[PDB]
Symmetry: C2
Subunit: 216 residues, 2 copies
Amino acid sequence: NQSSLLAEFGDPITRVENALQALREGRGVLLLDDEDRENEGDIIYAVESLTTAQMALMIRECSGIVCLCLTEAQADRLALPPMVVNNNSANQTAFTVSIEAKHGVTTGVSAQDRVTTIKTAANPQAKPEDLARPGHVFPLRARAGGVLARRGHTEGTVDLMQMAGLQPAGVLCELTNPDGSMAKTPEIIEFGKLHNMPVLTIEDMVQYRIQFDLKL
Amino acid sequence: NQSSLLAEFGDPITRVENALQALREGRGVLLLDDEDRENEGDIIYAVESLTTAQMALMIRECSGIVCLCLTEAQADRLALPPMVVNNNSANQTAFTVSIEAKHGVTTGVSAQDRVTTIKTAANPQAKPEDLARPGHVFPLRARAGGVLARRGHTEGTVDLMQMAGLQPAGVLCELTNPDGSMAKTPEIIEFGKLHNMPVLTIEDMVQYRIQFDLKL
Ligand SMILES: O=C(CO)[C@H](O)[C@H](O)COP(=O)(O)O
Ligand SMILES: O=C(CO)[C@H](O)[C@H](O)COP(=O)(O)O
Ligand SMILES: [Mn+2]
Ligand SMILES: [Mn+2]
Ligand SMILES: [Mn+2]
Ligand SMILES: [Mn+2]
């Protein structure tokens, strides 16, 4: 069972602490949501240490649809409305209109261009016009309350950054197997081993926030 | 120079004929746009023969942001408005709001789910509600006139399908190098060799349409 499979990463508190420490060191982590939800593992990286090589890894190993998780304040600062008014997607994933950096990029898709666009959007001094729309980076609005309000990877990502003392912005992308099927827990653990990436779950995060009166 | 590099695929007419023949056989092709434009090569597949293995190849070898090129009529039939009203992206790429199949899929990202969503959207009997919005497939509206009106991969894709006698819908995604840089003409030719994919250019297509009074 999943809990058993993740015992080798530690108990849930340790799984969380190790994930926060990796983010502080500028490395990436792997977050699983609930098995009854998507049952998917996302590579997560902090924006402030994001490199081209980290972006290249997400693109060649994940779905390629790399999302920027932002606070509501930061999405508002950028004037990013939701992509659609009545979002009838399954999880109601909070996609804004997509974005490209307006300067410093060419077609927008190269790993470097995506990082340039991500760092431009996430800049606390960003202004709306720094971003052309549409583009090849996909922002997601994290709910206030984080994973204590919505058990999504979006909220997990921004919560991880805050809990780690980092700028509240991170990127994510779903781990995909070579044959196009989505990575399940055994493949996610194995990929974390290869790439020295801690593995944790939203459930670990909820327990942790609800054991250390953590309001972010 | 590029023209020289592509002489080994034939003269421009032959490059086009070989691309149309591969599509009819259900294989994929590689389309380059103008060197002064994006200078990028897209893997293109026809929707009607699209398989999970073909979708898995685009995801692990390309940007992962897989687009469905549709006619204006078909995008209208699906009630797909442009993602943004004032599109200030560089090429004014005609992104609609993104889509997922409403039935037959789980999270939407697996290669199989994307094909399910693509085949649902492209179905000539499709209705708007067959697609949830937003999602993980990105439709693009091809301009009337095709590449004789707009020299984009979008129009190249739908034009290729029509010229080949196929249903006017195809998918595309930009060929990406392992390190995240975008594939340039030498890498595109080499990738076409490996995967037995013809290579052609929008310029080949414009010449061809303007040498065989081809109005589609
Ligand atoms: O759809 C996705 C991004 O395109 C992934 O499923 C991402 O994890 C969605 O976020 P969430 O888990 O918060 O709904
Ligand atoms: O942006 C893209 C898809 O996301 C690619 O550049 C695609 O080729 C864009 O289409 P076009 O060449 O017609 O502008
Ligand atoms: Mn910020
Ligand atoms: Mn998710
Ligand atoms: Mn059609
Ligand atoms: Mn293009």
